[PDB]
Design a protein around this ligand. Structure first.
Ligand SMILES: *[C@H](C)[C@H]1/C(=C/C2=NC(=C\c3[nH]c(C[C@H]4NC(=O)C(C=C)=C4C)c(C)c3CCC(=O)O)/C(CCC(=O)O)=C2C)NC(=O)[C@@H]1C
Ligand SMILES: C=CC1=C(C)[C@@H](Cc2[nH]c(/C=C3N=C(/C=C4\NC(=O)[C@H](C)[C@H]4CC)C(C)=C\3CCC(=O)O)c(CCC(=O)O)c2C)NC1=O
Ligand SMILES: C=CC1=C(C)[C@@H](Cc2[nH]c(/C=C3N=C(/C=C4\NC(=O)[C@H](C)[C@H]4CC)C(C)=C\3CCC(=O)O)c(CCC(=O)O)c2C)NC1=O
Ligand SMILES: C=CC1=C(C)[C@@H](Cc2[nH]c(/C=C3N=C(/C=C4\NC(=O)[C@H](C)[C@H]4CC)C(C)=C\3CCC(=O)O)c(CCC(=O)O)c2C)NC1=O
Ligand SMILES: C=CC1=C(C)[C@@H](Cc2[nH]c(/C=C3N=C(/C=C4\NC(=O)[C@H](C)[C@H]4CC)C(C)=C\3CCC(=O)O)c(CCC(=O)O)c2C)NC1=O
Ligand SMILES: C=CC1=C(C)[C@@H](Cc2[nH]c(/C=C3N=C(/C=C4\NC(=O)[C@H](C)[C@H]4CC)C(C)=C\3CCC(=O)O)c(CCC(=O)O)c2C)NC1=O
Ligand SMILES: C=CC1=C(C)[C@@H](Cc2[nH]c(/C=C3N=C(/C=C4\NC(=O)[C@H](C)[C@H]4CC)C(C)=C\3CCC(=O)O)c(CCC(=O)O)c2C)NC1=O
Ligand SMILES: C=CC1=C(C)[C@@H](Cc2[nH]c(/C=C3N=C(/C=C4\NC(=O)[C@H](C)[C@H]4CC)C(C)=C\3CCC(=O)O)c(CCC(=O)O)c2C)NC1=O
Ligand SMILES: C=CC1=C(C)[C@@H](Cc2[nH]c(/C=C3N=C(/C=C4\NC(=O)[C@H](C)[C@H]4CC)C(C)=C\3CCC(=O)O)c(CCC(=O)O)c2C)NC1=O
Ligand SMILES: C=CC1=C(C)[C@@H](Cc2[nH]c(/C=C3N=C(/C=C4\NC(=O)[C@H](C)[C@H]4CC)C(C)=C\3CCC(=O)O)c(CCC(=O)O)c2C)NC1=O
Ligand SMILES: C=CC1=C(C)[C@@H](Cc2[nH]c(/C=C3N=C(/C=C4\NC(=O)[C@H](C)[C@H]4CC)C(C)=C\3CCC(=O)O)c(CCC(=O)O)c2C)NC1=O
Ligand SMILES: CCC1=C(C)[C@@H](CC2=N/C(=C\c3[nH]c(C[C@@H]4NC(=O)C(C)=C4CC)c(C)c3CCC(=O)O)C(CCC(=O)O)=C2C)NC1=O
Lengths: 331, 177, 119, 164, 162, 172, 58, 162, 162
């Protein structure tokens, strides 16, 4: 884990298991054997379902498609299409989500990049609205993109991280929000799940987020949302801004620090063991020296915008409250 | 994904020197202790579903609110995935027993699993209980002290190997909590 | 690292390192460098220009100001001159690195450490 | 980083199975060829200095146009970079010789070399002159064990055939 | 957790200085009183079950209405008796934790923190528990400094409840 | 925050059992080790500023990069921040040497530090070389037969080395 | 003391668009010259201590 | 002043609770290491004058320009030598105070607090003092744990000065 | 960086007002004294090498033990003399930067900020660099208001060091 060790940053970014590649090198028909194809078929489920779990009984759904992949019927382009159209892929990814989340998942499953700009969303949402679900899925597969990057005999892979796809810097960072390394499934992480559309404000406005590598503490941030002011009325409380304008720049460049796990038991004010306000157990902070029942940190995950000369102090304060640092980005 | 060999090389690469005598000496002791590691992995692999069955069944019987309606072991599908999860954890622990370094287990499965079990609503104490049962069961098979299987092997001491396997299971159990 | 922890080697001497870790830089004189361990020969090279422990010692500067040894006043026998290598081909390889001629002699393997810290 | 054990663990991992007796036979062969590999690693860490010194000296003994002008190295600094690069190479031959696959030599030394040697006007044939001098220099059964010699020659040949 | 070593570390950490001789002396004293504490922990662990059962019987003899009073909170049901020896078992376990640690950390972080809201929200009076800890204090049967240790922490839980 | 004892108790409560007498015998053994522990912490706390200074001298001598114009270390400000960071790491290694657990170091110093030294452009491996030098100076210092009654201490040196190795492993 | 002149528009519009905390707003407000002329320069250095330990700490 | 007892009481006072077992164990351990500390204080008090004289001779032999350099700050005047043994006497007395107290309180509040501005504003280099404390560390001639105590506090003053 | 213009803009920015007549007058006066400051910068840039070498010779003549004392910090090594003229060259370059800027910005942000912990942690002495700046103040050889400028900034660095 990290960057410097092993001279490879991208292994340690959580993309360790996504480098392996699968192509059917066998031409004609497979008779008798069924090792190599069951491997490729498994990688197709691992790619298109994105590591979602398929039960033995479920494997009976899509069994026809599966018995046509093994034959000369479907190239893996078209088998991947057949896995994509079936009732499974509809239940998990299409039916649970709003239309936009569904789109972003379809890029994670089929193309392995994120959408970078709103217009990609314009294209796919437009096709869905004019013609329906099957033409939506065709509109992913029936494009110069899939054909060029995969060539019809190779199982899809995550390429959104890669430099070769032009994408956007935004789509690189967005790439790591959508893929959280081996264990996390489609609904395994928060930010996807079932009813969530994952990144919407981010993916629509091409707000490049930040990357928290998976693990090493602070693996989860799930940073709080912001509203938009008097027009489209908002609550101003919850998050620090991504911007930091003038008047406070003085005193060093501004850094956005995201602290991840904040909890009462963890928050001690620097000295170990939990502080007891009354002689016997009243552990919340006394507001006006009268007992309150309000937690010290009120949402887990608060952010800090801190200029350079104030970093050290803030860096101490986080570790006083036992909060753990997700990432720090210069702004 | 790094073995004992790769780990030493990476450390001697940050040092920017050649491997050297002290490091090669310890690595010679690794290779001379190689067949013990081989037979060890053979023991855990040839008791796999046995360990996973007893471990997760013990996890349910210790804490019977999991199978009560509303728990995360309440359906066949949830129980199947929970059973499957236990099998996969035991699988990458077996890989960490082969490689001698936990780089495969850290980079592959340990990374992101706490936050996934958070995102699913999986109770973490119950998972650490399951990992602990796989730890005691797995060390009991690795030392041939199982109460249902006593196979014949060449005599020797593998206390060090057992402490190593207990280190990997304590790494997973500490990693989910 | 599992490989080292299970089969650890023995730790060597620590006299040189303790001499540097013990007292401050004005207390102990020459030892202070102590912790300078040995880099590969290319890192003494001109893009890196590393330093040696013999640089930090008083012995390295050693320049007499007002000083002439005559070497004509000596008895006729006792002027002896020795050349490390009596050949053309081996004093200079085709490439630049040399162990005799130039500044390239600075980048030989070994000699990175210093034994004057015994005072 | 490719080795015996990383190929078989990664291969059974891509399968989705626990490691059967096949992977165990593979790592059994690792611990069979181990002694010859580590003997070669001991002697390489023994005299790396003189190996790199003979390598660069013969590399400019062959091609003199390197110091002719801008092409190659015409200054002490560039020749310092020369001997440093051959230091890196023998150090990666030591590393791949310890690991026993061509993994660290491939990912650290070989992967994406071509853009670097191409862009920075570095001729690869001079590298090959250095390595083919050191390839020839070792004497069978004069220092290392005959199989160790084989191991060393194999790895060095891999470097040459990956270079140009 | 509040161990003496962790307040030593924590105090010097809040000051940003090293762990100079003051805190080292503190860790010394912990290392000395530790032995008596360990012996006391051994013997409390030895006769746990009869301490807990004896303590519940003392609470039942002191407050005989509790087994007679029909309700959820009182120990008339079999459930109620199970919660009874359950809770007294918790206090005994936290005392053994504090004897092992050497400070009042595990009691203050597992038991004392927020005990009031519980004794209120389930209407459980402090006095019944107090009688339990008095029987534990009488029947632990330790001797000497070990007994002074267990009497120290048990008395401390008594003064938390009132 | 957890020492040895808090880790044992915390696991014992995470399963909810008592301590067995085996556990208690282990604790008693670590207590008898504890005087040697305090001795090593005393040696570190004593000579600490010479450790940081000499290790930084060996760092700048072996790597002459950072003292030169445009170097990360360079400027009076940047040099002082460099030295102070080394003092930080040495302070917390003294703390984890006392606690017996590596929890305080991870919680207060190491965890999240990589995100900073990435965010500033600071070369991680140079920090790792610095911490290797404080490990050498500190371990050697810990093995001094001066002023202490003589006795066997290989396990404690091993553990202390594990703490420094964890610091250099967390920056790199 | 509060008036249209003294009023700071900029620390508001930063603080509204969650760019500073209320703590830094207070730190910032005090540093203002609209406070330096009006509460500071008149006071004896010992007495300006009083209004600060009272108006920040209560 | 920073004594171990005042750290204990001050921490419990900032928490508003009593002086439970943690702090009492701390005061125990202070009361055990106190005896060796008192013996060390007795013998430093015993041979003070020869330690001060010896230390000033060591500074003069290590830096021989100081007696030769004509100025106010240097020890060429008779006044300068009086200030020399005066200052070395201060350091020795503050070490004996910290041996008696058991923490580094009196050195941190009488000597360490504000020493930098003095060594600057009168151009007194930190190093000359370091050589003095090294000679005191060599010539105090204690043995055993007492020697570990005086070497601890003297080394502590050395690491304050640099 | 702390230039007069940036103090003007920074103050008006913290007040949120414009750059009214006060700050404009400030930038006027800076624009007038700037010319003599630039000529002084030209001539210090001109005779840098002899200023550095001469200053190091003055430090060596004032403190002759420095070349004789065996240590890392003293200028007895080859390395030590290189660090000697290196540091004096730094002081001269920061003076020329302050002459160009017109305020003490670059010295306060490149040199003054945190100089103390460096001169302590490497046991460097304030006096050695003070004697260096005295020789620079004697031998710069400027005349008139330019000499008042270089004497201003050089003296400023001297009063920072003490
Ligand atoms: C067993 C001790 C648990 C529990 C297990 C369940 N896991 C469920 C889902 C799930 N689990 C994982 C982690 C797993 N997948 C991997 O690919 C790897 C490693 C490579 C691991 C360790 C993932 C990613 C997922 C999401 C995808 C999927 O559904 O398979 C799960 C289903 C939860 C649900 O749908 O509600 C369960 C029940 N069962 C328990 O009772 C304990 C807490
Ligand atoms: C469209 C615009 C666009 C860019 C601007 C780049 C930006 C970029 N660079 C890298 C990736 C990289 N970029 C560098 C470059 C660096 N090497 C160093 O020594 C310097 C710090 C720095 C040059 C100044 C390196 C070394 C990598 C590979 C990093 C690694 O794998 O460790 C990657 C990840 C994918 C890859 O490996 O190529 C991306 C997106 N890519 C794009 O698509
Ligand atoms: C390809 C698969 C493959 C294996 C599975 C192993 C199996 C195996 N183990 C040993 C050999 C050995 N195996 C062990 C292991 C044991 N120590 C104990 O305390 C436990 C009972 C047990 C670990 C659970 C020991 C100790 C030896 C050496 C026995 C001896 O020399 O006395 C040998 C003989 C050769 C040797 O000495 O290494 C073989 C073939 N080797 C292989 O090639
Ligand atoms: C890990 C493996 C590894 C290597 C193998 C080297 C390969 C390598 N060499 C150079 C760079 C260089 N390599 C050489 C070497 C040459 N001089 C000549 O006369 C000959 C043709 C040739 C020696 C046989 C020179 C001269 C440069 C500098 C080129 C330049 O700046 O013009 C660079 C660019 C960075 C640099 O300037 O150092 C790299 C990546 N580096 C590595 O990290
Ligand atoms: C790490 C790898 C490694 C190697 C492969 C060797 C390669 C090597 N060989 C020699 C040196 C030598 N090698 C040989 C060998 C030869 N005798 C012949 O009749 C044949 C042509 C040939 C054997 C096939 C001889 C004879 C010398 C000595 C040459 C001499 O001094 O004239 C030297 C110079 C140093 C020395 O004298 O030993 C080196 C570096 N050394 C290493 O460190
Ligand atoms: C960590 C510390 C810790 C404790 C100390 C306990 C304290 C505690 N006890 C109860 C709950 C209870 N506790 C008792 C116990 C009593 N029965 C009687 O006859 C006596 C008066 C008394 C034993 C001396 C009973 C009977 C209940 C259930 C009350 C009810 O449901 O009516 C509850 C509510 C939740 C529950 O029903 O279990 C809690 C928080 N729980 C904790 O987590
Ligand atoms: C509580 C723990 C804790 C730490 C561990 C530090 C970590 C830390 N270091 C810096 C900051 C810094 N740290 C260094 C240190 C370095 N100089 C180099 O040459 C080396 C690579 C490295 C020493 C080994 C430098 C130079 C800076 C300033 C960087 C800059 O401003 O360019 C900062 C930003 C704030 C500041 O400028 O001080 C922080 C948080 N701070 C803390 O609060
Ligand atoms: C408050 C601070 C504080 C300390 C710093 C220690 C210091 C200390 N150590 C020992 C005692 C001891 N200390 C050591 C330690 C050593 N073993 C070796 O191999 C090394 C040389 C060295 C570790 C680096 C040993 C072995 C003993 C026992 C000596 C003996 O009985 O022979 C004693 C005597 C009492 C005892 O036996 O425990 C004391 C006071 N104690 C304290 O109260
Ligand atoms: C230091 C520099 C600095 C700036 C440049 C501003 C920039 C700025 N403007 C607004 C905020 C705003 N800015 C405008 C201005 C606009 N009204 C329109 O009809 C036009 C499009 C536009 C003027 C040309 C409006 C209307 C808002 C409030 C928006 C809203 O709440 O809907 C906010 C959010 C906080 C707030 O509500 O005040 C910020 C940071 N603030 C600063 O601190
Ligand atoms: C509480 C702690 C404490 C100290 C440690 C001293 C430190 C100290 N020394 C001096 C002052 C002095 N200190 C010395 C001492 C020196 N003579 C030399 O030759 C040596 C370099 C050095 C002894 C090793 C001298 C000579 C003076 C007078 C300097 C002068 O007037 O020129 C002064 C200024 C006031 C005075 O003149 O006395 C102070 C504060 N004072 C304190 O209150
Ligand atoms: C930006 C401003 C700036 C400075 C002013 C310098 C200040 C400075 N000097 C040194 C370091 C040094 N400075 C000197 C200089 C001295 N030799 C002597 O004989 C005299 C007493 C004195 C010259 C008058 C020496 C010798 C060292 C090296 C000390 C040692 O390693 O022992 C160091 C430590 C890093 C290093 O080794 O270079 C620093 C920060 N550096 C800066 O970045
Ligand atoms: C009624 C619900 C229930 C279960 C289900 C079991 C599950 C179970 N197995 C254990 C532990 C355990 N399990 C096995 C594996 C197992 N034994 C063998 O000899 C063979 C061949 C096996 C697979 C078929 C071993 C080897 C151990 C270690 C103890 C031993 O030596 O047998 C332990 C002890 C855990 C611990 O030590 O913390 C439990 C709880 N217990 C229950 O109460």
């Amino acid at each position: 884990l990290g960057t410097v060790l092993g001279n490879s940053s991208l292994d340690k970014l959580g993309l360790d298991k996504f480098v392996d590649r699968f192509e059917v090198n066998e031409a004609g028909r497979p008779d008798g054997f069924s090792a190599d194809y069951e491997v490729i078929i498994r990688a197709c489920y691992m790619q298109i379902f994105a590591n979602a779990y398929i039960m033995e009984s479920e494997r009976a759904e899509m069994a026809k498609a599966e018995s046509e992949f093994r034959d000369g019927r479907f190239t893996v382009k078209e088998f991947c299409r057949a896995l994509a159209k079936s009732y499974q892929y509809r239940k998990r990814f299409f039916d649970g989500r709003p239309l936009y989340g569904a789109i972003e998942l379809c890029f994670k499953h089929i193309l392995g990049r994120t959408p970078d700009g709103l217009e990609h969303y314009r294209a796919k949402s437009a096709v869905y609205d004019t013609k329906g679900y099957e033409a939506f899925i065709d509109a992913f597969f029936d494009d110069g993109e899939y054909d060029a990057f995969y060539d019809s005999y190779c199982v899809p892979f995550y390429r959104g991280h890669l430099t070769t796809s032009n994408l956007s810097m935004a789509a690189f960072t967005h790439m790591f929000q959508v893929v959280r390394g081996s264990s996390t499934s489609d609904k395994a992480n928060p930010r996807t799940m079932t009813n969530q559309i994952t990144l919407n404000q981010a993916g629509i406005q091409s707000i490049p987020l930040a990357v928290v590598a998976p693990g090493a503490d602070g693996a989860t941030f799930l940073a709080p949302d912001a509203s938009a002011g008097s027009w489209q009325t908002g609550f101003s409380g919850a998050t620090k801004a991504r911007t930091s304008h003038g008047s406070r720049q003085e005193k060093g460049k501004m850094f956005r620090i995201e602290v991840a796990n904040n909890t009462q038991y963890s928050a001690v004010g620097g000295g170990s063991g939990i502080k007891l306000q009354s002689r016997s157990g009243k552990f919340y902070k006394m507001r006006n020296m009268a007992p309150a029942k309000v937690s010290t940190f009120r949402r887990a995950n608060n952010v800090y915008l801190v200029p350079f000369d104030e970093l050290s102090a803030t860096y101490i304060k986080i570790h006083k409250n036992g909060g753990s640092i997700a990432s720090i980005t210069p702004v | 994904m790094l073995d004992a060999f790769s780990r030493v090389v990476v450390n001697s690469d940050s040092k920017a020197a050649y491997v050297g005598g002290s490091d090669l000496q310890s690595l010679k002791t690794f290779i001379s202790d190689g067949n013990k590691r081989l037979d060890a992995v053979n023991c855990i692999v040839s008791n796999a579903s046995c360990i996973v069955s007893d471990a997760i069944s013990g996890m349910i019987c210790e804490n019977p609110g999991l199978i009560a309606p509303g728990g995360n072991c309440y359906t066949n599908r949830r129980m199947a995935a929970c059973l499957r999860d236990g099998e996969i954890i035991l699988r990458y622990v077996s890989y960490a027993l082969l490689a001698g370094d936990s780089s495969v287990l850290d980079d592959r499965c340990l990374n992101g699993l706490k936050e996934t079990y958070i995102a699913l609503g999986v109770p973490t104490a119950s998972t650490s209980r399951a990992v602990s049962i796989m730890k005691a069961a797995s060390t009991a098979f690795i030392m041939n002290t199982a109460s249902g299987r006593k196979i014949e092997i060449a005599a020797g001491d593998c206390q060090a190997l057992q402490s190593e396997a207990a280190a990997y299971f304590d790494k997973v159990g500490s990693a989910v909590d | 690292d599992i490989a080292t922890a299970v089969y650890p080697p023995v730790t060597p001497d620590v006299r040189r390192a303790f001499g540097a870790a013990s007292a401050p830089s004005t207390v102990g004189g020459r030892k202070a460098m102590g912790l300078i361990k040995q880099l590969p020969f290319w890192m003494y090279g001109p893009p890196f220009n590393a330093s040696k422990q013999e640089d930090f010692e008083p012995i390295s500067i050693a320049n007499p100001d007002v000083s002439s040894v005559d070497y004509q006043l000596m008895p006729p026998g006792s002027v002896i001159v020795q050349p490390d290598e009596v050949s053309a081909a081996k004093m200079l390889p085709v490439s630049g690195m040399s162990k005799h001629i130039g500044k390239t002699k600075r980048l030989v393997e070994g000699d990175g450490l210093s034994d004057y810290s015994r005072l | 980083m490719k080795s015996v054990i990383t190929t078989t663990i990664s291969a059974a991992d891509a399968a989705g199975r626990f490691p059967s007796s096949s992977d165990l036979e593979s790592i059994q062969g690792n611990i069979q060829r181990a002694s010859a590999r580590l003997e070669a690693a001991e002697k390489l860490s023994g005299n790396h200095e003189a190996v790199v010194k003979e390598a660069g000296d013969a590399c400019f003994a062959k091609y003199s146009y390197l110091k002719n002008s801008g092409e190659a190295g015409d200054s002490q600094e560039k020749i310092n970079k020369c001997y440093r690069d051959v230091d890196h190479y023998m150090r990666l031959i030591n590393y791949s010789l310890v690991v026993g696959g061509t993994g660290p030599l491939d990912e650290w030394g070989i992967a994406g070399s071509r853009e670097v040697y191409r862009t920075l006007n570095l001729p690869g044939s001079a590298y090959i002159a250095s390595f083919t001098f050191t390839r020839d220099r070792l004497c069978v059964p004069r220092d290392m064990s005959s199989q160790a010699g084989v191991e060393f020659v194999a790895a060095l040949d891999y470097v040459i055939n990956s270079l140009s | 957790m509040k161990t003496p070593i962790t307040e030593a570390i924590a105090s010097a950490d809040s000051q940003g200085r090293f762990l100079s001789n003051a805190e080292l002396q503190s860790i010394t004293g912990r290392y000395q009183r530790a032995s008596a504490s360990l012996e006391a922990a051994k013997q409390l662990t030895g006769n746990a079950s009869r301490l807990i059962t004896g303590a519940a019987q003392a609470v039942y003899t002191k407050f005989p209405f509790v087994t007679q009073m029909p309700g959820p909170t009182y120990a008339s049901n079999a459930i109620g008796k199970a919660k009874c020896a359950r809770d007294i078992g918790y206090y005994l376990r936290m005392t053994t934790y504090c004897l092992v640690v050497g400070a009042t950390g595990p009691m203050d972080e597992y038991l004392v923190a927020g005990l009031e809201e519980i004794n209120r929200s389930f209407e459980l009076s402090p006095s019944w528990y107090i009688a339990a800890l008095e029987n534990i204090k009488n029947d632990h049967g330790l001797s000497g400094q070990a007994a002074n240790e267990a009497n120290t922490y048990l008395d401390y839980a008594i003064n938390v409840l009132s | 925050m957890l020492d040895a004892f808090a880790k044992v108790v915390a696991q014992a409560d995470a399963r909810g059992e008592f301590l067995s007498n085996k556990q208690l015998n282990s604790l008693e053994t670590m207590i008898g080790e504890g005087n040697k522990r305090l001795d090593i912490v005393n040696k570190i706390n004593s000579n600490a500023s010479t450790i940081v200074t000499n290790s930084a001298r060996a760092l700048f001598a072996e790597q002459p990069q950072l003292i030169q114009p445009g170097g990360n270390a360079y400027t009076s400000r940047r040099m002082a921040a460099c030295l102070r960071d080394m003092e930080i790491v040495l302070r917390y290694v003294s703390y984890a040497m006392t606690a017996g657990d590596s929890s305080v170091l991870d919680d207060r110093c190491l965890n999240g530090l990589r995100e900073t030294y990435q965010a500033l452009g600071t070369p991680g491996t140079s920090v790792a070389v610095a911490i290797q030098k404080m490990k050498e100076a500190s371990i050697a210092l810990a093995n001094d037969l001066n002023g202490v009654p003589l006795g066997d201490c290989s396990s404690l040196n091993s553990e202390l080395a594990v703490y420094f190795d964890r610091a250099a492993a967390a920056v790199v | 003391q509060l008036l249209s002149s003294t009023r700071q528009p900029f620390l508001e519009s930063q603080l509204r668009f969650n760019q500073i905390t209320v703590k830094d707003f207070i730190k910032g407000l005090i540093l203002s010259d609209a406070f330096r002329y009006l509460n500071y320069d008149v006071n004896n250095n010992y007495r300006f201590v009083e209004m600060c330990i009272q108006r920040i700490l209560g």
